[PDB]
Amino acid sequence: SVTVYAAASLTNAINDLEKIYEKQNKVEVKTSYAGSSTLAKQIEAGAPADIFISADTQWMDYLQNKKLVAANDRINLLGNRLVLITPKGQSLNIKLDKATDPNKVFTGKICTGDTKSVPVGKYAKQAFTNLGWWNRIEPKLVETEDVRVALNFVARGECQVGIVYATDAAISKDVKVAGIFPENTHSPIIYPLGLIKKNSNSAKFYQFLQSNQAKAVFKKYGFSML
Ligand code: MOO
C-alpha cells in the first residue's frame, strides 16, 4: 500500500487517480486530505505518509528543513489561480485592483483559510496586502482550516464571498466566480510533490503522479502542469 497526504484542494483529482492506480496495480492507495499545514505537522509528528502534496512551497520547505524530504525527492507539480467566489444566486463582479474599495464591495463576511497557516489564506493575505486592503479586510474574515471548508461555507450562504482556488470554484455548482486575482498580487500558486518514504511502491506512485495519464486528470480539474 501507499499513503498519500494531499492538500484539500486536490481532493477530487487525487481521488480519481487513486481509483485509476488501483485498477492498474495490485497496490492499495490510502488518501488523507486537509490543510497543507495540518498535514505537514502530522508528518512531522510521525504520521506514516509515503507521499505529501502541498498547496505551497512553504510547507514542503518546512519538512525539508526537518530532513523529512530530500531536495532531490520533491518536484513542483501543479499551478493554480486565486479567485473570489459568491453563492450561486448572489452573483457579483469585483475587480481585484487597488482602486476598488473593499468596504463598499464586501458588505458581509469573507471566508478563506487561516491567513497565517493554510496556503489559500496565506496567498489571500499576500494579495490583500499588495492591494492595500489588509486592514479593511481582516475584520471581515471567517477563517477555516482548509480551502474546502471555506468553499462549503460560501455554498451554504454563511459568507457573502470567499477566497478559494480556481479549481475549487469549478468543482462546486453552488458557487460562482466573482473575480480572479491577478498573478502579480501574490506568490505563484505552486504544489510541490514530495516523496517522504523511499520504497518501491511509493516511488512508482510518485512517478505516476507525473505521468501523461495523471496530467489529463489534473487538466480536467483545472490545474496547470508546471
Ligand atoms: O492546503 Mo489548501 O489546498 O490551501 O487547504
Automatic annotation (TrEMBL):
Where, in this chain's numbering, is molybdate bound?
Answer: 9, 36, 147, 165
- GO CC terms for this protein? outer membrane-bounded periplasmic space
GO MF annotation terms = metal ion binding; molybdate ion binding; tungstate binding
- Asked whether the UniProt record includes Signal among its keywords, one would answer yes
Disulfide linkage? 111-159
Its keywords, alphabetically, are:
Metal-binding, Molybdenum, Signal
**GO annotation (BP), single:** molybdate ion transport
InterPro entries in the cross-refs: ModA (IPR005950), ModA/WtpA (IPR050682)
**Does the record's keyword annotation contain DNA-binding?**
no
Q: Which CDD domains match?
A: PBP2_EcModA (cd13536)
**Taxonomy, superkingdom:** Bacteria
Q: Which PANTHER family does the annotation name?
A: MOLYBDATE-BINDING PERIPLASMIC PROTEIN, MOLYBDATE-BINDING PROTEIN MODA
Q: What protein family does this chain belong to?
A: Belongs to the bacterial solute-binding protein ModA family.
The annotated subunit structure for this chain is: The complex is composed of two ATP-binding proteins (ModC), two transmembrane proteins (ModB) and a solute-binding protein (ModA).
- The entry's protein name is Molybdate ABC transporter substrate-binding protein
